[model samples]
Target: ERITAARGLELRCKGWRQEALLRMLENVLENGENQKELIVYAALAKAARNWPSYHAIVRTLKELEEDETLVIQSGKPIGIFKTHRFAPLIVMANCNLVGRWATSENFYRLQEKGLLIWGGLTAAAWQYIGSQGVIQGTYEIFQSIARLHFNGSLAGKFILTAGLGGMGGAQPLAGTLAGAAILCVEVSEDRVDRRLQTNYLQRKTRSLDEALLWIEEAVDNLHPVSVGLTGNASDIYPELVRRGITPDIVTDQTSAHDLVYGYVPSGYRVEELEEARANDPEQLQRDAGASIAVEVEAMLELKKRGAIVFDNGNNIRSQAKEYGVQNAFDIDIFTEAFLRPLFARAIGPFRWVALSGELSDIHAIDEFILEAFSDNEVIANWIRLAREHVPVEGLPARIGWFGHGDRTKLALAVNQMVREGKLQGPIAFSRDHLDAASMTHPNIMTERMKDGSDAIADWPLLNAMLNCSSMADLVTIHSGGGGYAGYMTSAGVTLVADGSTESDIRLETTLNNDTGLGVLRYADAGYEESADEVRLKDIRWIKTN
Candidate 1:
């Protein structure tokens, strides 16, 4: 239970004197340990005390100001929450095309996609976990899984069908193949209602099997195995994997033995060589494990400078050395012997390590370090400080859109972010015309058209812009509703429209579409209409960050 001002006052009256309260405050205000926990406790205590807790903490810590807080009393909320499940690392991947020629560039493109996917999943996961506390009537149990992924080959086409056009065939397939343990797909009920009223549903409704097959084909080539057959309709792995499906292999060399010589390419990037070394420490040991090893075999060109050796059974030491080999792990195991000390050192000296995929094994590594430190407090403290640097609260401030001269490119980018961890937030769509008419059709629609049938044609791109804009607006509102969160106001949209001429109707339609979605509250239609030259209906973008 967090100590609130009332609780603090109660504690004070109940014989837990001012010193105890001060100690509690020190835990949050001065100890520099688990700053988040401390901050939460301090905030509660101040609230209990009737002092302006938020302002007081913001002044005392000078760090609390960086965090974005959204307090809700009651009412209909925009997003839904599931049970407790939270993943901190998010990875999104696409397979349909690998256009970038440079390996690093391609890898980076994948990473960017991973970020967007992470954001979306994070939204769901965080709410699930946070709300669990609300249900329990106490905020005690906190869950933080380390990784999440959104994977698909040829993901762009899928995005067009799934995102812009609402031709929902591939997202579920791509999401499942990406190893997403939890997925949330949303479609505007109003849009469906409108289509049903206009008979679009009668003409366009697809069979579930057909929809499933379309999704299956989109991701069949990206399954985990090519021939290890399984059972049942859901278990058709062999057919799916036959095309070239397999799990994402972050490391090229799986065996420890291969990692040793992986660093032979001196001309390669230092980071890659470090990664090779980290993975192949046994090889490093044989070559540079000891001064004796370094000197013994002239054939083994081992540098003795940073040589350190320990038995393989000493797994913790091995993990440290591996990180050291990769040059990414900057902890001095020679000094600390466990990972927390190393993690603490690394957190202090370097930027945060992107924990991208399944982190179960690495959590052991993290635990081992904390255990070595004699308690989990070090880990807690690290998490608290690390939260400060987490980009989640400020990410929307940096997003922008780009479109190739083709509608295909625009679709691809949206799909890319969806798979990537960038598009994390509540997604809302404008209802179809029939639904709009049934609901409160915005005054603008009545002024422009009598039937609103044309609204259906531009629904996809219109919804995309609206969804992106509404999400951005909500993020802005939630972050402080007024205060600046991140410097860039990270937000953007990728538009996929008909590859036709730009007409005043098209421009007005786009504006009305976005306004209906709730994006116009934060930005103007002027930015959307006359911004870039990628294309009119085919492609275009406008960035306000």
Candidate 2:
């Protein structure tokens, strides 16, 4: 109901820079959340852990001077420090655990003690742009599938996927974007309704028979569409296999990685699942594990029947292993097969929000991108389709998978727009933690690195520390966003484009160095594409004998 006060010139803080952070904090809710408790989009991902902490954050921001820095430790405001005006107004470190105690088993211990909370990649960082960010990822991965496997086309292809929650909801839209008939099975009818509300999915059905017929009709007519079938994947997937029909492609994104909180066990209504989570936690875990095993075995059987199968990075495959599915690794994680090449080139989720809350601001930014980089079909197509189809849940925003050279270029160009008054006001520019060189998830981002440095973590930590000192207005170092604990350590930055002279160079230097980390890391990892990209950019590194 609260929409971040769109179309306004008033300030809720000291300046638009602070207003940028304040509004984003609220806008994360405006995107729809449990504002009464600050659950932005995920079950445990909150802007602040509690109402008092949230109110304290808002009050502190309004009174924050340009030279002061607000320090939020695990979503609670702990201190305000005197710092230079160009320094970050806020710096956050969320849910970080010592290596020995990094498991989710230990994480929930502190979570119950009120010491910390889990911040899903974009959630706690306040960088989530809703389904638009996930759509950027789906667009990239789907295109990769088309480019590598289907001879530059997804026409008449049937993509079978499950989960239409925060991250998975956009899969249907992007599947259709790539000319594929997709059947997305979501357990929660409410989540399905949410996707349909955005028109990301055109229709919903309780009948798998009708959903399959719709897919057949779509492919038969040389058209592509998405159907949201309301059912649990554990039940529906195996049932589909029993019917002797195999999909062309298969994956699952049912939040299986966070089995205790995020995943819903089959045959349990949402209401009953909540009760089980509280009253019979161990029983629910056993039920969830059994259900995931069924879903994974179904995927493997489909793979055996000639379907292209991947885990899609929700870590379902890993969960399957706990249930005695020894060959769960047979299904590849999506990143290694489809997304790693893009990361090697520093191309990943780069996104922005209009501080003025003006829709025209993003339209102008999109136009700038099209005019500047019309040569890239991926970028161009994302702009065109996003313009036509994507819904703005909160503040008007745009996300694209741009790499080092283009990211710095486009961001600075839009900065100049604000400087020259072409845009209404400032813009808040950031990237997903899952973006290039920002994360080291052994199961996903770091899996099977060529140089075998798959478990390396210093690079992401370096990026976090570096950006905090790189004049970015806000920077966050977070852990536990990979749907489990101890498996991920990622970081991201937020820089305000306020049209000031300092901000102009801040945008240039911060982005160049931020993306520079990606290039450097990939080059170190023996990626030749990264090596070539570095040489062309004149980025220097010492050679080892």
Candidate 3:
């Protein structure tokens, strides 16, 4: 395992800024799906183009000076530019293609030639903090489901789903935490074992009957439990329907976005799938696509049977559509169904990694959060529950949803804590790329826009440039890699709270401008939630007044 430095006060890099990026880079590897292949969480992602590029990225971050910015092209360090300290320490342009050449076929062709790599969201950006990083976000989605559909509780609810890989691993824990009994079907036995070892999953079995029994019993008792069953979602879901059983909730998080490497064809071993990948690529795609169609039909049947169903934002619905399932998009994507209001309010994943790699540091930071945002029951309760439930995938870390004004305030507070010697070492702060104003996916993040601007791809670029000007330590712009290849855009930025005057300015400018642009985006799109936030926050925008 390529574990990161979990206990360190020394700078292995040139400065705290570079050191923070380095640790996160290594941390992604530690929690990645297939580190040996440079693969991280998503079905299509590489932490680096190859091992050689990985070494160069680490080495470049180490020897580089504060006044220079390392240039990364598709996860490979291309060169260093002589820039000022106020500029980003690293800048990346990943998986971008020209307008006419932006098809998956063309992108995969370029990838085969080694000129491109799909940097799936956080994977190529070095900002992932493992499954725990997404637990709170997943919990938030379930929390919304509870309030909207279950009358503010999930005590007697039963959820059926698939996938236990990196990002999807959060589902089981989040479901149980929301007071529901959940059955997660993961095709890969190893992935199931990993989640169990990390305590994200409470039980594991190979039998669907056993898994269903567990879910039924737990729901009847109003007790929360998460079970991992080893079986193909296609087989298990169809079998459930044949048995005249239906879950109260049905959704999926399997890497259905990627037909080639993500979703597996039904009734095949993982090894044979690999062999098919090498021996018959077209057959592999066709089988995976057909299987996804069956999975979607099963989900639609559940929906017809009165179960609440969603796509879970992994683009499974879109993949099924390509295989001739016309109504695959019938169910709303998770974001379109629930998260848009939060997105309109600029509420996104704001997480931090303890550079000291000490749990004590996180506890101290937790104390700070409780005191600072004690007024918000949601935030307060999340802090308390996460302390007990979230586990470290790599380094000790914490994630929460903080919007607009609070983001700047939280970063400022955390930096001051570092300055006052309240904790161990400098903290690394970053938001998820899927944050508002930072991502575009017609079927996912931007689905069903009020203004019919769902396919516009210019927002993420502006977000990247804004953060670049705001002195973010790391800035990235990525294309595709979001399930439907060549179908989305995203920007990611990172900064270190080193307790310096320089860091103070960087934090204030970066945080305000980062999510501030989000308010501008949604407000322009006629979201009153964002419009109200704009007036409440006194944001200076062209038409915000």
Candidate 4:
């Protein structure tokens, strides 16, 4: 009884981190050099039963391992022995059966029998970087601003948003990189101070008046700054509307995504809300939902007053709509409004980190990309501006949007640079799961699939399998990205190019196939440009009449 009780408490505290630990443990235990290959295959099957996308990934990895097409060493693929047939890596049984099972109910039954485990988001997948929170949050804001205005620039503008929690703290840094001054409000002083200490935010004040004054000054000088204001956005937004303080861009990243426990009640102090959250979660939900309605109402007013308002993928509009705010969706989602066209072209966040921990290495690759893609003005401009403004966060990383053809080209070029000794060391390449062909997010990636197939899990399952077969160093299949579990499924690929001729060949195939899946998925969704792109690239996509 004591052991059972201890296990329960441990799981409660570890949450998904427990699953990540389990996966790592399994990877180490099963991939020993002398371990029978059949044991590894069984281990893959065991891991797959844990989650929906895992089934596909495990099966694909098993296939590659069995066929000797992928050579595995110490839980990493060392080389590809031969290329597999070019196609979606796994065949879908049906919408309900992503890989083998016919229903989630049956999957759960097997899970109870110790056949599988659910890999939540990045937990089961090895891409869960502790510092990814800041990178992802900032990149979303930066990408939104780049896509929406000023020919992919955010110069001489102001971005008004709220929240300084884990996800929202990236706003100021991201806004500055986009050349915009940011005014972000947080109800908690501690949250503001935390960001200030990390340099994610440059300044802070409890007074909205002071924040506005500093914002205006920064705008006048065309200097970018992030000011964290300590106040409830529910109260501050309406006040800004009343004062006719119109910002150039408007959004929010509050706990509005979670109507309860995430957002605080409007009339209560932060301390009071904490108490209520612990004691009266039901009531907290009601009040927080109502506060979100007011916040959305003010956002609508800001929209009417000439600001470009958007839902930062926070589901704030849905909460407001539930509270009877008739036009709660007056502003569009950032993905739909700005990122759809890029997705159609199989373009998404393409990021790399310098393994040598040298900023000079990143800069060298940046110049290489600029010179290689010189005719592509969009990419060239982004590189030029990134060099001027964006700072290396965490692991000396750089992220920019790249499409199917260009993404593969850049990856191969970087691999070659390492071989030529131009780079300090090998580079690690990865991307946001929120990318073209990688995800089946109903409210975002697949929101408007031509055939109304937004909820189908097959596409992302196939994506994970394909990347596994392509010999990526790390392939992750995640459920519940964008903070909605069971509602979203996504995959990500990470490859380390160690400058071996073998590494160059693997990079070429994996990079092309990874982004190639995006092109194919969109084409299957009846996107004409995607179809044309597939045809032009001579990608072996099966055509339908």
On TM-score, the leading prediction is 3
lDDT, candidate 3, 131-157, per-residue tens? 877888888888888888899898989
Give model 4's TM-score versus the native structure: 0.73
lDDT of 1 at 139: 7
lDDT of 1 by residue, 114-199 (tens): 32111111121111111111111100100110121122222312211111001111122222222221111113233233323422
Task: Give each model a TM-score.
Answer: 0.18, 0.97, 0.98, 0.73
Alpha-carbon runs more than 4 Å astray in model 4: 1-156, 220-223, 267-277, 481-483
- TM-score winner between 1 and 3, please give it: 3
List runs of model 2 lying over 4 Å from the truth: 1-7, 481-483
Q: How close to the true structure is residue 300 of candidate 1, measured as C-alpha lDDT?
A: 14
TM-score of 2: 0.97
lDDT of 4 by residue, 1-545 (tens): 00000111122212222222233323322321112321111112112232234333434343452123433221222344544433222221111223334333454454456444433333333333222223443554566666656566676688899987645776777787667889999988988997887677899999988999999988888898899999999999999999988898889988675554467768878778657856986787788888888989999999998888988766678778878788986787777676666777788777776655577888999899888889988678777766765554434567778888788888888988988989876676777677777887666567657778788878777877887777666666655411243456777676766577766767788889888888888888887888888888887789668
Residue 108 of model 4 has an lDDT of: 45
Task: Please report how far candidate 4 places residue 73 from its true position, in Å.
Answer: 21
Q: Candidate 1 — which residues are off by over 4 angstroms?
A: 1-172, 175-545
